[PDB]
Amino acid sequence: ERPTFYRQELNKTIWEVPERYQNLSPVGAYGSVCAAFDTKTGHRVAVKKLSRPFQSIIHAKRTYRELRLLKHMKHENVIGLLDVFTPARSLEEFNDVYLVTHLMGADLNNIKLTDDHVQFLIYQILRGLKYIHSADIIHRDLKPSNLAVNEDCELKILDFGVATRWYRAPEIMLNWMHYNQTVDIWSVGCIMAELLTGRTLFPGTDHIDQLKLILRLVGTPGAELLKKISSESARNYIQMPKMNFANVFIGANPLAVDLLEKMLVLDSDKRITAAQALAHAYFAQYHDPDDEPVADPYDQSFESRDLLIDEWKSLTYDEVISFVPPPL
Numbered sequence: 578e579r580p581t582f583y584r585q586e587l588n589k590t591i592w593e594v595p596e597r598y599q600n601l602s603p604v605g606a607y608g609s610v611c612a613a614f615d616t617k618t619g620h621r622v623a624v625k626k627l628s629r630p631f632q633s634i635i636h637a638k639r640t641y642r643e644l645r646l647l648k649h650m651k652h653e654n655v656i657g658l659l660d661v662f663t664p665a666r667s668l669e670e671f672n673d674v675y676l677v678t679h680l681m682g683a684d685l686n687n688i689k690l691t692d693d694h695v696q697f698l699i700y701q702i703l704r705g706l707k708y709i710h711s712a713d714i715i716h717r718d719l720k721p722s723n724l725a726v727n728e729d730c731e732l733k734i735l736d737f738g739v740a741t742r743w744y745r746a747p748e749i750m751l752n753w754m755h756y757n758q759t760v761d762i763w764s765v766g767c768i769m770a771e772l773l774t775g776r777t778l779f780p781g782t783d784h785i786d787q788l789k790l791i792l793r794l795v796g797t798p799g800a801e802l803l804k805k806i807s808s809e810s811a812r813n814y815i816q817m818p819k820m821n822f823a824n825v826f827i828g829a830n831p832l833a834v835d836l837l838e839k840m841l842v843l844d845s846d847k848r849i850t851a852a853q854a855l856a857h858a859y860f861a862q863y864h865d866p867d868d869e870p871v872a873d874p875y876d877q878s879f880e881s882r883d884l885l886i887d888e889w890k891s892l893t894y895d896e897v898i899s900f901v902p903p904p905l
């Protein structure tokens with residue numbers, strides 16, 4: 578049943594991996610991540626050694642959460658789990674978790690982009706977000722560095738864990754209660770803007786400067802939206818004119834400007850969803866209602882639980898043991 582592991586020191590870091598994975602080479606920003614050769618598939622992979630996975634309740638829950646989320650994701654435009662392993666033979670000796678994913682070529686932060694490429698890249702993000710959102714999962718940290726492409730411009734959403742705040746929706750700039758899945762659509766708008774102009778749309782130096790730069794584009798809220806804000810601080814802070822997107826994004830595909838106007842809406846209740854955005858004219862070349870799948874249901878009940886490290890650790894171990902490799 579159990580493979581043969583081999584040990585190796587890489588960054589004064591002990592890596593213990595199955596013989597399956599060869600020629601481990603550190604990729605050191607992304608965490609403890611090595612490019613490896615998978616002798617079973619003949620394809621290169623990424624192997625992530627979780628850092629101090631059971632150091633604390635917080636780490637333990639984070640470890641469990643990352644493994645639960647990765648085991649769930651079965652979509653072309655979302656990072657998926659090829660393998661998860663531990664060198665541990667028992668729950669008793671379980672202290673290290675290794676995750677195996679596809680190796681991606683470059684982050685979108687690395688990559689003048691043509692309108693074709695913007696269309697295809699934002700299409701693939703929305704297709705992935707449709708899937709993630711359908712399981713009631715919110716990304717919450719979409720930014721160029723969390724999006725990866727191969728040379729084929731095939732895109733995957735991931736979360737590696739510059740500034741998040743540049744891409745963050747106004748309604749979660751202060752308090753994290755009154756928000757929905759469309760926080761991720763705001764992020765998609767900021768990314769798409771950047772892809773079209775080669776500039777950060779909203780390079781705020783802090784959470785208040787950020788809100789200033791956003792309002793300068795979308796305009797200060799009307800009475801309609803001001804009435805839906807609970808926080809005296811946030812309301813009293815905000816308490817001018819909406820710019821013509823066609824002026825700001827001069828020379829863009831006018832259909833890219835129209836979609837941007839539907840994505841960068843202050844009122845999160847009126848912001849276009851991933852599903853709706855896919856059906857926008859911009860994506861006429863790439864939209865197929867029969868190849869934009871939704872996810873299986875995702876059991877998120879664990880998010881509400883306050884459990885001990887040994888409880889989170891045992892749950893993670895179960896999820897390692899029950900893992901079913903995807904087909905080749």
Ligand SMILES: Nc1c(C(=O)NCc2ccc(C(=O)N[C@@H](CCC3CCCCC3)C(=O)Nc3ccc(F)cc3)cc2)cnn1-c1ccccc1
Pocket residue numbers: 604607610623624625639642643644646647650655656676677678679680681682683684709714715716725734735736737738
């Ligand atoms: N560097 C790499 C790799 C890698 O590193 N492969 C391992 C790998 C990657 C991502 C995840 C990952 O996305 N994990 C997510 C869960 C899943 C998401 C859920 C929401 C939707 C999108 C997927 C997570 O839980 N992150 C996390 C965030 C904050 C934390 F405090 C703790 C964890 C896990 C393992 C491949 N390719 N590359 C690569 C190489 C060269 C150039 C560019 C990229």
